[model samples]
Target: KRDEALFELIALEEKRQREGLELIASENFVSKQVREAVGSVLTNKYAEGYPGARYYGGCEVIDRVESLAIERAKALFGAAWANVQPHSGSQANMAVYMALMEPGDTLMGMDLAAGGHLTHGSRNFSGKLYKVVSYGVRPDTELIDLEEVRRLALEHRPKVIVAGASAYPRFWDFKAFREIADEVGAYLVVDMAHFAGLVAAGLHPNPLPYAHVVTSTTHKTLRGPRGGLILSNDPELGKRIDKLIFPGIQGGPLEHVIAGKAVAFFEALQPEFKEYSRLVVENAKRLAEELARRGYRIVTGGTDNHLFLVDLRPKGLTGKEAEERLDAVGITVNKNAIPFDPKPPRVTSGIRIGTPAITTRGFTPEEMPLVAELIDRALLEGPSEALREEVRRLALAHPMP
Candidate 1:
């Protein structure tokens, strides 16, 4: 019975993978090579510490795999040094924090309610423990205000100024953040977890030159294993970060996932990956324009990035209801809080959607227009049974692999 249940679970997961119109902003499908490497024999070993400095024996081969991963990641992002050890994005961020500052250090970042991640400075463990000051968008433009960031950096004189976001649908001003950090003599850390793939393919500006410390997850747009990385150009900063990730934060590195990261990086270097990144933006733009034409309020007017937020107040639907309705029609999205939202985060007034997964499925701009139409109809029509049928049909027509 146990074996049967496990098989059934795997079947159900595969079925869901096949049929769904995956629009979640923080997800993507890895290539076959990546999946194979991530499940390979490297997972069985324990490789603690960096290459040539491991405490354990019988890790020479594992060290080679990890070295390739580090080199590929550096080449992909133009980072001077890369550590593929952190277990997740948050852990990577933790490594940066530990490497750069002491406890109770002042950190100025974007407000969670304004398109930033909780780790940036919400009421999470990171914010509660550190002296956090967060900035939000101007009411008129649900977009980041660079001037405010500069002013805050000057006034707060924070030890670290973080720039980047989870739900933001526009390009980041990493250069501006660099300038602000320069003014305050603070470290500029940019978490490009969501857009690392775009940067690799040249669809988005790479943050390597502007940021002193950069952290990212290998999944999402990068389309690798579910792991995290920390990168820096400064040799001193890199050494401190590597030490922080090993003895300071995590124990042994996930070697199987490091192999997968190498494979994904190789794939990203191909010309086809560049086309894929371009299509990601095109799909997102098509969806945003169509949703707006149908009367939904899109955050920041539109997107310069892969994901966009839909404000549901104009449609009289809570984000919870929107997520449920869209899921009913096989459209996957996340409920997010709007800047001026009156409701709690669990029942907020916005839904975040992206095209990385759908683009991975090989959908072109031609299909994106219909995708836009179906999504708009689903949100506007409020989940009629007939509308659900139409949406399923469209999803079937756009099979990813």
Candidate 2:
């Protein structure tokens, strides 16, 4: 290839992926068909508008490609409308906020330290532009407190209520959230970025029925190309959001990625994806239980979904050191803050782990206990070549498809 340097780096990345046990909570592997579509010739085409309303000429094929993605998205989410062009999940939230809120409207969301995302009111534009109020998990339970959420919502009277997180490990009560939002007269926006795959597989609650709008990233649990998705059961709200995604934020749509989303949605519709989702949660729960038995503390005790937060304080290790040690031994995870973490964000007290990527690599629940033991060795005994070899052997056994 003409771009040898870039292609070499890409190949190296592929090698790294194949050789390691991926435990990052927010990453997943897409199918080859999804990859092919993302790298398709559609990349060269400029799609500046929705299907049937293109600013550029010669969009007949692109129209079908996009509509296919949109329709599939609607089916997967049971939404009346789907916009597959936000570029990323953050952008989707941004567009939804603009569509439904004024620049300085009061916004209520889960706290960032309590499993929420940056777009859910960190120092980002969402927080900077809106009067953002935050709700968090209880210190004792380390789980979201509905009463606190309601009290804050009533006191703050936010125009928009954002529900969701980047690292939460339990199921959501969208029905309760809807009731709370109704009492506060707030628009309920659920960002199911972490558990969209579980929801698609019927393993988690569907926010579409309870939320005014829902947002997600395709690459997370959905196991698709890196992109964003927005779903709304209200077509009136959907139309407004569609405009917000186009002229309000992004320029032209990535038609190739949209095609990849279509392919992934098709894959999710299959019976196999459901089994895959089931195994993901099963593996996560098993891994968390194993780690807990090894003297580690899992935030919220355990998980009900595909990811969990391992508090490393019990091992007298910082999240940074744990992540680095695990990385050195070919196990991957990200440092994260637990609720009311004494440590700073840059050096959190915990590591967030998930099963989506490893499950995609074909790992099963039976394999997770060994995964926990390997993580234990890397964290407790420190990284070693033998441990790295063990990880490589296990990863190789379940090679990436």
Candidate 3:
């Protein structure tokens, strides 16, 4: 916190937030309350374990803080148990895996190109360590095919069936996944990191009853700190998840972030949070529709959720190029892979977009078309750098930060 380079980097980051438009589906701009909570005195404590069960003393205050987060999360999602300790989404997932499986147990998850997270057996981490059998979306539809999932489940007979993704843009049928898990006697773990705010706001379907384990990031649409959470409708599994998070995965909880999580949960329970969730979906739909009208191809045709992937191949551009152009235009989004894409991961044919951050900045549907227009310019006039510069100017005019 004292280094000049660090301070400069922090200032630059704040400046970026103050000026740029965020379209990355896996990101969000937290509220001032959430920010304050993260910087509170709670950061000094060492609450090494759960409430009524700690490995360290002076946990009474932190215990109540974490308890509020857990209780509020349970009520919000109708989960019977909740764990608010994992440092990140990936960490949350690791704890879930450790809770229900051994090192060599077979598991099934969505492919990264088909919208799965890296922690969900993406070959490099968990998949490399475990026996991972991955599934993918249909080549033509660019959406999850339930038949394929069931077929894979029947063939592999995995111990866990993970349902989640970082780039998907549609409503997931949790019950359908639950049925497949039931057939295989597999635990269904739903990662709702991208849509927890939507669930909290009643804008998306809940996964508690369908999934035995649910993990999510506290940011994204939740607008909390950068942390991971786990919840379950089963008391026994929840206790297992708690133990796994502590003794098996992490040693100590970030009490500062826990306080932030509490504030975010409390804020999410308010009526305005529901409104924010509604706006997130509305803006995404409007943006997707506008992009489609401009001849951009959206995966799954259109979105029924907070994010969508735009296939840039039709416009004779790569996803990386589009991302660069948009970034120069003060619009931030990430290059992503469409199923069976022709290009590599770093230079794919699609870019993923979402509405949480822009919605946080108070951008409405009417304003969304303008963002789409910027994207159109980036894709169509790839050589016209001046247009992107103009976009940067236009987008900065309504900065919220």
Candidate 4:
């Protein structure tokens, strides 16, 4: 059943991944077991509802897989209830919004220029359907401005206050956001998609206690298959979210990906995952320090999590140039907009680097300096054969798990 072109492309993509260093903050390599579950027979099932209340006749096995995923998700995040059915993080946000607010209801979220995801506002659905209010980082500090968040909440009186970011490298003060949500009488929804893995490893603060609902992708640092999860401490809200995720928004769920998420949640439950999470942070910190020492400006000074933005303006290079130049030397990273950048989104001022994938490949703090220096040479001195070879050699040395 293999289409030659598709299969060949898949194989080539795998080769490319193995030969190049993956630095995309939003990316990660899943485990062998996860791949197995994702490719399992469960994908054949048309389970349109929760475990026992499914539409399909032969959903018994799918039920078990789904229930395991749900429980494991609950256990991993210490959530009272969880829905593992959302197709993606964006869809998860959609369902959460449907459960909490109506069309045209005001919702407050971080802006894209200030390290927020497109789902937060943008010209995306969230913005199209709702009255979206955006809060940005302080111009000077380049950090989430709680003052602005509070001021916006008061000024707009939003029904939902969403807190989280994609490029933001610092820890969110969920407690502070929760207070603002309360003062404004809004539902606090924390999209912890990027940091959920660290939170699962007990390395980052859990938003479950502060957020009325928490949404996340199971991949990234979680190292799971691509899918989404929604968690909440409130059982009633969980019930609402479940219905919204089902008939209110989506139809039949992807049981195979659910099984993959189940396996990942189980893996995160183990003690070894804590070490992996710890290494991710250290590698990111080391990489940021090395880049900064080489004269790159680290957004917000440095990162407190798994990724950071390296402002390339000082080097007289646009983010687009750095990205292409680095890509030429077997490195992969996305150009990102630094806070208050003069450049447009397409030609951003910075490039975002992450360590989750490399850390998964077993890279440690010791390798960060070399990786950074290689990046420096690639950007400043221009790409060379030796640099590409070293990158290929390092990547080949640490085979994908």
Q: Which pairs clash inside model 1?
A: 361-400
What is the TM-score (0 to 1) of candidate 2? 0.98
Q: Write the per-residue lDDT of candidate 2 for residues 1-401, one digit (tens) a residue.
A: 39998999999999999999988888888888999999999999998989888999999999999999999999887989999997888899999999999988998888888888899998699989999899889889999999989999889999999888988888899999999999979999999988999999999989999999999999899998899999989999899999999888999889999999999999999999999999999999999999999999999889999999999898799999998999898888999998788899899999999989998988888888899889999998898889999999999899787
- 10 residues in a row with least lDDT, candidate 1: 392-401
Q: Indicate the worst ten consecutive residues by lDDT in candidate 4.
A: 54-63
* lDDT (CA) per prediction: 0.86, 0.91, 0.86, 0.91
Please estimate how well model 3 matches the true structure, expressed as its whole-model Cα lDDT.
0.86
Q: For model 4, state the Cα shift of residue 287 in Å.
A: 0.7
Model 3 steric clash pairs: none
**Model 3: lowest-lDDT 10 consecutive positions:** 392-401
Cα lDDT of model 1 by residue, 1-401, tens digit: 37997899999887787777899989888878898998898888888988988989999998889899889888888888999988999999988987888889998888888878989988776788799999888888877889988898889899999988898888887888898899889999999999988999998888889999999998999888899988888768899888898899788788998899889889988998888898899889888888788788888888887998898898799999889888888888989988788899779998999999988877777776688777777777767778777766665666654
The residue ranges of model 2 lying beyond 4 angstroms of the native Cα positions read none
Each candidate's TM vs. the true structure? 0.96, 0.98, 0.95, 0.98
RMSD list, candidates in order: 1.7, 1.1, 1.8, 1.1
Ranking by TM-score: 4, 2, 1, 3
Please provide, for model 4 over 280-338, each residue's C-alpha lDDT reduced to its tens digit, 9 standing for 90 to 100.
Answer: 99999999999999999998898899999999989999999999999999999999988
